[PDB]
Design a protein around this ligand. Sequence first.
Ligand SMILES: Nc1ncnc2c1ncn2[C@@H]1O[C@H](COP(=O)(O)OC(=O)[C@@H](N)CC(=O)O)[C@@H](O)[C@H]1O
Length: 585
Amino acid sequence: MRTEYCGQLRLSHVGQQVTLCGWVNRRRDLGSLIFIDMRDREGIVQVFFDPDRADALKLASELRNEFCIQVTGTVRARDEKNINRDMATGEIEVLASSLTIINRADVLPLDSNHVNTEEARLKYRYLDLRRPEMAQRLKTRAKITSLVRRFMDDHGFLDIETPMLTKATPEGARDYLVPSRVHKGKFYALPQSPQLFKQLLMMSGFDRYYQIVKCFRDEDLRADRQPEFTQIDVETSFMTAPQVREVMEALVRHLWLEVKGVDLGDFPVMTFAEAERRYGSDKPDLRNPMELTDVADLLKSVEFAVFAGPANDPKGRVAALRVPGGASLTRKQIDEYGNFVKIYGAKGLAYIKVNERAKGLEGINSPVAKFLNAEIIEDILDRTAAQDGDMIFFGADNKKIVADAMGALRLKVGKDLGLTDESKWAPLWVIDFPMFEDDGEGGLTAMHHPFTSPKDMTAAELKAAPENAVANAYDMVINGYEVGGGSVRIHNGDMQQTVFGILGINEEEQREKFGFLLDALKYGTPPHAGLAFGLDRLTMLLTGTDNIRDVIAFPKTTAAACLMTEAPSFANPTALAELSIQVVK
RNA sequence: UCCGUGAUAGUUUAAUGGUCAGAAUGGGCGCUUGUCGCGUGCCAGAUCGGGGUUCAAUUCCCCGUCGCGGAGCCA
Ligand SMILES: Nc1ncnc2c1ncn2[C@@H]1O[C@H](COP(=O)(O)OC(=O)[C@@H](N)CC(=O)O)[C@@H](O)[C@H]1O
């Protein structure tokens, strides 16, 4: 019933009589003249009202912000003097000839003139979406899923939906349950991912699978984690890790080219180890020129426990972080970080201010130089390539803390000091993650998941040297975000049992929770491997946010709630009756 | 579960142990023929819950509630 979208009107439409549908973005009543900025998904147009069209001018008097209206008029140009060089429809305006108010809007819970609170934006998400900046991100999402499916189809992947009311799939997180009314006492599990099912689809013979799916993990949030998120899930048969990475890297290289006009180039490949080593993170943000430099060897003989303990401990590490120009840091700045590294378990944070390297010791300033010496200090500077003006922090504890603390620090200092080049893109693959990690209760846990194949290893070899075992798994990271992760699957019942075993899953359980899989591995399973992207995160990077909820139409709070609909909600007593369940007192 | 931070008109948010709780935007009624952050005049517009301290609490303390960030947890 509309004949054009407000935002699409241009000088070319001059003369066109049009019927616009939308909302009032702004009302300017100059008494005899009313200027209404009409808006719809495409933009804003200025409709003009004047004394000729009496009733219209009068009715227009009633208009308020966000009123839902319809207007029919004619597109005329504006005199040079009235042109708005800051609006797409700027050279034009539509002279109203008729105005109809479909609906009025009560006062808005969100003032359209200023950065509203998150809590408010969420509670009234639908009004918040009306903002171009926000609506735009959802359009770019759509452009992404369109580009994705077309790319995947052209590469012969079949888009297959998997079950939501299903069995428990181990992705690491906690499972959301769903009690059965008909089968009382038993529940379903919302999928943490279609993992087990896509593997079965490979065993079924579909050769290449993919799906844009909703995944559910009952864990706590973060700016890049929602308990319900969307993955671009993919799986293949008869393909190696390299081949999988190749086509996955091509999808992404393709997304950036079509959405940002940027050619990401060939992705660098780095091992889990090289990563933790140079950046103490398996999601290295390569836009940051800084990196950890180890210096334990240099400090084994030093009579300073803080350094000597970790330097002479196999489990310990001593990493120096050279922050360019960081000598300027204030004593309170050096303290905020000192506290910051504590968040990750670091006891302290020693430093060395490099003022004049040529002047030797009298050229530097550090509360620990009395424990080091002219030569040790020079080695450390030479190593880190530290020069006049720079600072050098140190992290000394067990490998893990040094990595976590100094890893975090490296990012923080980088952003604070404006060292991190946010002008570019840093894609890369991180490969060879270990197969297992210390679970903390004496056992082990699967890094990626229990259906991940070891890089070159026999069920017998794994069952013997598990802790060491390198998984044939890979992660794609961009600008510090782990936007995708995958692995070559275990297509061998023998292997699958050895793994369940190492992960301490007894037979009874192997049968209760993974029986269908252990049996399916008996019918000629092909070699298979896959990977899943975090669609949300991929959109964040492509729409320029750092907030995952900014790319999800209806996000949840860090407390897993939906303010706009106030959910979850207390259930009806009889509802729970038919569910054979009761809340615990 | 924990740490950090915030809680004041519709909204964003200033201040404050005793008083005039300030502004912008927004709302109501005027005036106003080229505005586009319209301008302008009058009117109305608020201190999260419980407890505590205190002569007195929006303000101080504790607890609880909720948003955000982070830890744990979770790729
Ligand atoms: N809570 C979350 N909120 C938002 N995004 C999330 C969340 N959790 C994960 N992601 C994103 O999804 C990618 C794939 O998930 P994975 O856990 O790596 O593995 C899986 O789901 C395997 N089945 C994939 C495979 O083996 O093929 C992650 O890289 C990440 O960007």
